[PDB]
Amino acid sequence: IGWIEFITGPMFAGKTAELIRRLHRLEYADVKYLVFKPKIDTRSIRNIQSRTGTSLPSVEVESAPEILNYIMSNSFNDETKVIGIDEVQFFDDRICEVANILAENGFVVIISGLDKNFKGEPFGPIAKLFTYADKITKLTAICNECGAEATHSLRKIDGKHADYNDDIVKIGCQEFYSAVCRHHHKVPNRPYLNSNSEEFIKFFKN
Amino acid sequence: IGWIEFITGPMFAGKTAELIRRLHRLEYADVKYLVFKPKIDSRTGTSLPSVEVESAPEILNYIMSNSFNDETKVIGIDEVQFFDDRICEVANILAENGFVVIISGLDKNFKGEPFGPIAKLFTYADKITKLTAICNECGAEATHSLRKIDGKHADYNDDIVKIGCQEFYSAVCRHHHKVPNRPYLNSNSEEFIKFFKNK
Amino acid sequence: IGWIEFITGPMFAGKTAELIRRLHRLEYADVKYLVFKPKILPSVEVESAPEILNYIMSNSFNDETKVIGIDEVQFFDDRICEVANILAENGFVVIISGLDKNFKGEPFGPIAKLFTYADKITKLTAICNECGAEATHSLRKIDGKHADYNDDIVKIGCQEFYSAVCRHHHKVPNRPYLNSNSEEFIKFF
Amino acid sequence: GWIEFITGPMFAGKTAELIRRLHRLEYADVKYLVFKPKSIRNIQSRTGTSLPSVEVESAPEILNYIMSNSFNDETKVIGIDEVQFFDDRICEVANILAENGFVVIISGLDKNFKGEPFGPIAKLFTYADKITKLTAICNECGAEATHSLRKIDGKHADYNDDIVKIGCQEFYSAVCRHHHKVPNRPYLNSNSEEFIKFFKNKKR
Ligand SMILES: Cc1cn([C@H]2C[C@H](O)[C@@H](CO)O2)c(=O)[nH]c1=O
Numbered sequence: 001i002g003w004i005e006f007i008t009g010p011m012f013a014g015k016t017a018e019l020i021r022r023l024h025r026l027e028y029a030d031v032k033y034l035v036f037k038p039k040i041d042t043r044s045i046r047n048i049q050s051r052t053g054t055s056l057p058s059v060e061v062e063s064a065p066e067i068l069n070y071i072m073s074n075s076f077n078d079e080t081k082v083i084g085i086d087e088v089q090f091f092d093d094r095i096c097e098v099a100n101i102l103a104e105n106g107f108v109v110i111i112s113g114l115d116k117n118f119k120g121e122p123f124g125p126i127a128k129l130f131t132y133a134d135k136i137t138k139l140t141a142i143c144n145e146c147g148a149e150a151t152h153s154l155r156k157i158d159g160k161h162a163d164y165n166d167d168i169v170k171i172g173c174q175e176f177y178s179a180v181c182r183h184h185h186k187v188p189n190r191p192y193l194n195s196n197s198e199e200f201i202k203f204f205k206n
Numbered sequence: 207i208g209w210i211e212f213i214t215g216p217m218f219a220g221k222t223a224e225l226i227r228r229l230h231r232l233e234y235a236d237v238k239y240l241v242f243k244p245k246i247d248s249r250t251g252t253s254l255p256s257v258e259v260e261s262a263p264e265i266l267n268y269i270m271s272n273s274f275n276d277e278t279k280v281i282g283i284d285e286v287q288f289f290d291d292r293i294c295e296v297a298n299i300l301a302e303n304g305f306v307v308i309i310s311g312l313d314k315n316f317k318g319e320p321f322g323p324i325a326k327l328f329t330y331a332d333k334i335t336k337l338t339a340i341c342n343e344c345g346a347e348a349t350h351s352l353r354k355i356d357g358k359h360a361d362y363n364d365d366i367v368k369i370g371c372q373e374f375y376s377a378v379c380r381h382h383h384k385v386p387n388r389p390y391l392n393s394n395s396e397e398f399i400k401f402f403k404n405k
Numbered sequence: 406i407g408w409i410e411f412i413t414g415p416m417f418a419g420k421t422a423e424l425i426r427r428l429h430r431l432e433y434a435d436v437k438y439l440v441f442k443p444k445i446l447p448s449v450e451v452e453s454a455p456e457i458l459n460y461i462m463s464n465s466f467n468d469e470t471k472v473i474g475i476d477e478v479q480f481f482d483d484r485i486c487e488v489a490n491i492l493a494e495n496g497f498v499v500i501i502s503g504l505d506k507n508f509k510g511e512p513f514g515p516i517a518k519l520f521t522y523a524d525k526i527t528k529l530t531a532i533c534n535e536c537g538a539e540a541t542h543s544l545r546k547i548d549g550k551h552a553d554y555n556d557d558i559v560k561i562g563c564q565e566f567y568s569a570v571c572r573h574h575h576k577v578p579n580r581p582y583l584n585s586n587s588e589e590f591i592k593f594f
Numbered sequence: 595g596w597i598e599f600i601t602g603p604m605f606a607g608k609t610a611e612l613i614r615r616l617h618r619l620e621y622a623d624v625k626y627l628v629f630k631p632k633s634i635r636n637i638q639s640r641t642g643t644s645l646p647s648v649e650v651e652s653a654p655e656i657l658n659y660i661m662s663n664s665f666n667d668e669t670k671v672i673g674i675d676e677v678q679f680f681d682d683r684i685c686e687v688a689n690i691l692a693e694n695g696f697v698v699i700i701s702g703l704d705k706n707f708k709g710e711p712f713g714p715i716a717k718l719f720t721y722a723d724k725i726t727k728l729t730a731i732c733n734e735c736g737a738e739a740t741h742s743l744r745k746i747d748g749k750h751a752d753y754n755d756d757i758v759k760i761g762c763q764e765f766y767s768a769v770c771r772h773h774h775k776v777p778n779r780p781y782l783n784s785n786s787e788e789f790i791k792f793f794k795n796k797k798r
Pocket residue numbers: 011087114116117118119153154168169170171172173
């Protein structure tokens with residue numbers, strides 16, 4: 001039938017390039033595809049920057065269910081069998097049901113997005129997406145500090161690491177973000193929820 | 207140094223075999239490992255001797271105890287889906303403190319939904335291997351575990367924890383996983399299915 | 406430590422795009438690289454595989470460079486294997502891209518050995534021009550007609566001569582069988 | 595049909611992985627058949643997992659067996675272990691099976707003790723739809739191991755030694771590239787020796 005492919009990893013891993021690669025191969029077989037992207041609510045963005053440059057044509061949607069409405073609309077080409085989704089982490093939980101129904105109905109769904117927000121925690125609905133994806137490709141970047149495989153995105157404001165309670169959404173590139181390995185990802189004021197965690201950390205440092 | 211590998215997929219995909227395979231390689235290089243499993247009520251082969259723990263934090267307590275050999279820097283964890291949320295913090299802390307953590311567990315419960323705390327482990331895992339079984343119906347790659355009782359597919363609202371093997375469970379592809387009374391959260395979902403149904 | 410990464414698959418699989426992706430990763434981390442190509446996307450053209458080691462030894466080479474890219478590797482001879490292994494042994498990361506099969510479906514030049522020496526292998530798929538399944542083979546056609554087994558290996562070109570196909574849609578007239586029971590088995594089936 | 599190739603050094607779990615892939619079929623009631631070159635009745639991993647197998651002297655005998663009354667017509671999957679012991683003819687056999695609707699899952703060593711391609715396997719990489727290069731753990735440094743090292747009386751095996759030698763930990767270990775050393779390894783390119791010597795000196 002259909003299925004879900006999920007492309008993930010930190011910033012600077014080339015996630016979007018990988019999505020473009022997968023769509024370009026469809027073009028040589030003349031297989032039709034359609035790409036969607038979430039439109040962030042700019043009222044919920046702390047500081048808006050105006051920029052429109054993009055490497056990949058996609059239809060902006062305000063919410064995940066609007067993908068299904070678009071497919072039901074006159075704008076949709078009925079021969080389209082592949083649905084691409086970029087920057088998926090900006091959707092809410094509603095994307096999971098959408099992607100599943102698409103896959104259950106004969107579509108190949110190719111999804112790209114960040115696995116972790118700046119805190120190193122799951123970004124929005126992507127945790128559940130991992131579970132539903134038939135195929136996962138977790139890409140790596142290169143650690144800006146040591147050059148090892150980078151698995152994390154680190155936000156720095158004026159050289160200072162971002163605090164745990166800072167805003168999830170902050171749009172930007174190298175001016176705010178670097179790719180780092182686990183070892184070089186530090187988040188000030190990260191809490192511990194287990195009762196014996198800080199005891200263990202103290203124990204192993206002696 | 208220190209990272210997490212996650213081995214996942216439906217029942218009958220050989221997850222435990224893959225965990226065994228990964229850990230067994232260590233024995234030739236004299237690298238010690240220790241396996242943990244949650245408290246849970248064959249062909250030829252040796253199973254992993256493993257410490258039974260009632261909760262994820264008990265893993266760290268064990269490591270700090272006189273029972274743990276401090277030369278051990280590889281930690282195995284099987285049936286991870288039976289843990290609660292606290293497993294993620296345990297795994298991350300181990301990885302941050304020089305341990306290699308190799309984890310196996312089901313990605314989906316019988317409803318086709320994320321099993322326990324599993325979804326978060328995908329994000330925290332450096333390496334993910336999603337294994338496939340073989341669909342009991344069509345032979346394609348199987349991605350889901352299906353529960354039947356007396357021939358009938360288990361209803362959506364049945365209990366999640368139900369221990370057993372082939373008497374209740376089979377592996378199926380997406381198309382052959384059906385859950386009676388599965389709810390739709392999005393208001394346009396059933397509209398779309400009916401719309402697309404018409405050819 | 407050094408190593409070899411190998412990107413492969415048929416035409417229209419996006420091999421070059423994947424090579425580009427991996428090198429672009431390096432730029433964000435301030436890691437310098439250098440790409441080489443055989444004679445007939447920025448690269449240094451070399452007439453043979455050992456010339457890569459000569460260029461590196463020359464003073465036109467940036468001493469900072471720790472990553473070596475090699476595109477269209479199937480056009481080199483077997484000498485590329487030693488060169489690649491030498492670089493890996495001497496601290497370089499070598500990222501190689503090339504076709505795994507020629508139009509006949511047989512190993513393209515030196516790549517068979519390269520597979521063995523590579524630490525990491527990524528075999529990419531294209532989309533079959535005939536059925537849309539995963540494509541693993543490159544098919545040549547000259548005038549609607551499939552290329553004969555004994556046609557020339559090197560023939561530079563794009564869609565005017567070539568397509569991606571799955572194994573089932575890859576057909577080569579006059580393909581010989583070297584095993585005595587192969588035709589006996591095929592007739593049986 | 596199609597071809598899957600499982601490879602990498604000794605102690606990587608290759609046979610264990612073949613067994614895993616084939617065991618999956620049993621729960622779905624899918625028949626398979628395992629072949630091995632040359633326990634004689636089965637293939638086994640080093641943790642005691644095992645499957646029955648037919649042993650063959652050569653690749654063409656696989657097709658002969660499949661054409662005989664001993665072959666179950668329901669068989670969809672063909673497994674082949676220790677493939678490095680076959681000759682070049684294994685490629686054609688594997689291709690023909692894949693072309694005739696069989697899934698062929700193949701396991702074997704990629705490199706001999708010299709670090710060179712083991713027998714016919716270089717071509718199998720090309721013909722295999724799916725490649726799984728497994729790693730062992732370096733006996734020296736604990737890094738991912740990619741090579742098999744042979745030792746004779748505690749000393750590394752010479753380049754000109756016999757390729758075929760049956761044995762486990764008595765002779766063989768798994769090592770990373772850096773810890774794989776073979777005395778009297780020849781340089782085939784006329785500028786390779788001058789490169790190493792130049793580059794080593796560049797650390798001045
Ligand atoms: C890691 C991270 C990235 N981003 C943004 C930066 C980029 O604009 C975009 C990734 O392409 O997501 C966030 O908004 N929050 C985060 O926590």
